[PDB]
Amino acid sequence: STGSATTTPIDSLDDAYITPVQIGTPAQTLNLDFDTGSSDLWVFSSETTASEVDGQTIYTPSKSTTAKLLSGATWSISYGDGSSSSGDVYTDTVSVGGLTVTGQAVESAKKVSSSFTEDSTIDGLLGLAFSTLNTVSPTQQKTFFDNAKASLDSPVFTADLGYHAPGTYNFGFIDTTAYTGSITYTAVSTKQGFWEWTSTGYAVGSGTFKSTSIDGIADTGTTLLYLPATVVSAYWAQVSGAKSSSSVGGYVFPCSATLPSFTFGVGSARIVIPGDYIDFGPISTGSSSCFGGIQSSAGIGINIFGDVALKAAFVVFNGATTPTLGFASK
């Protein structure tokens, strides 16, 4: 089997991407944030504290003839950015782009943190990291991909995120028309539960490539590119007037600037992030200070190849017995 679904930016900055997901019988379609940095499929629901729901579409398990309470199971997740959610668990039928999993754990939120409430466009998350990170207790549950894997034509999914435009998540096949050149594959460590890999270096603009190992995670659920302070300083030094602002929480730059590209290495291959992908717009409405899309990972504890990086590539998440990641230009 295969599946193919369009993923759409939630706003004009590509702060996140939402993908429609069918849950239950009859289908209830929710727009979920596909997150290769976590492993829980959770949704706003009829059980979510009413004051914490503000415009989201909810899953109502009582209206699904295929929903079953997973007795005794609870979940609670805290993301690295400080957001969180928790609740109980149903199993139900879940379909993405025509690919159906029966008995998928659907984690129903009883509580969500303010950042989720305040984003009316995201109805929940669909985790695509390794199932070892799933938070369901006392019986850990599998991700949608893990459940689908054996049925797929090939045990892969691909992320093709758009810049200020829709893109595609495919399951079970590689669309050879969706990228240019070849896909370069690189090793993955699953030791921390992530799609963790080592970039071979970077360049800023038309500058020389610096060969250096940068361990990080391919994370569709993180907006920005978080890299070591040395790398990030080298990038922003090429933008007149750019500075790190402790009050704002990162590098800012004059909105009048033209940003240089940023290149990262995948083996001997190179992925170029155009400068415009690194612009996250005014820090507050009407400001002429703009927020940078490349930020320091210092104090995160890990480097994160978030959407800023991934949207410059066609990315293969290869879930074969020994997982790997593939990157192609597009």
CATH of the domain at 24: 2.40.70.10
Exposure b/e, 143-170, CB count within 10 A at least 16 = b: bbbbbbbeebeebbbbbbbbeeeebbbb
The three-state secondary structure class of 263 is strand
Q: Among the three residues 174, 205, 228, which one is the final residue of a domain in this structure?
A: 174
Looking at 86, 199, 296, 297, which residue is catalytic?
199
Supply the range of the domain harboring residue 250: 175-330
Measured CA to CA, the distance from residue 296 to residue 302 in angstroms comes to 10
Looking at 35, 119, 146, 219, which residue is catalytic?
35
Q: Among the three residues 151, 174, 197, which one is the final residue of a domain in this structure?
A: 174
Same domain, 296 and 165: no
Backbone conformation region of residue 48, classed left if phi is above 0, alpha if psi is from -120 to 50, else beta: beta
Same domain, 198 and 84: no
Stretch (H or E) spanning 230: helix 229-236
Same domain, 200 and 151: no
Tokens read off for 257: 């600037």
Outline where DSSP puts E strands in 52-195: 68-78, 84-96, 99-112, 124-127, 156-160, 167-171, 184-187
Quick one: 112 exposed, middle or buried, by C-beta within 10 A (0-12, 13-18, 19+)? buried
Annotation says 160 is catalytic: no
Q: Total structural domains in the chain?
A: 2
Backbone conformation region of residue 206, classed left if phi is above 0, alpha if psi is from -120 to 50, else beta: alpha
Going by C-alpha positions, the residue among 172, 169, 125, 130 that lies closest to residue 310 is: 169
Measured CA to CA, the distance from residue 169 to residue 295 in angstroms comes to 26
How was this structure obtained? X-ray
Same domain, 24 and 42: yes
Backbone conformation region of residue 55, classed left if phi is above 0, alpha if psi is from -120 to 50, else beta: left
Q: Among the three residues 157, 174, 191, which one is the final residue of a domain in this structure?
A: 174
Measured CA to CA, the distance from residue 262 to residue 251 in angstroms comes to 15
Annotation says 175 is catalytic: no
Same domain, 154 and 59: yes
Same domain, 215 and 293: yes
Same domain, 18 and 165: yes
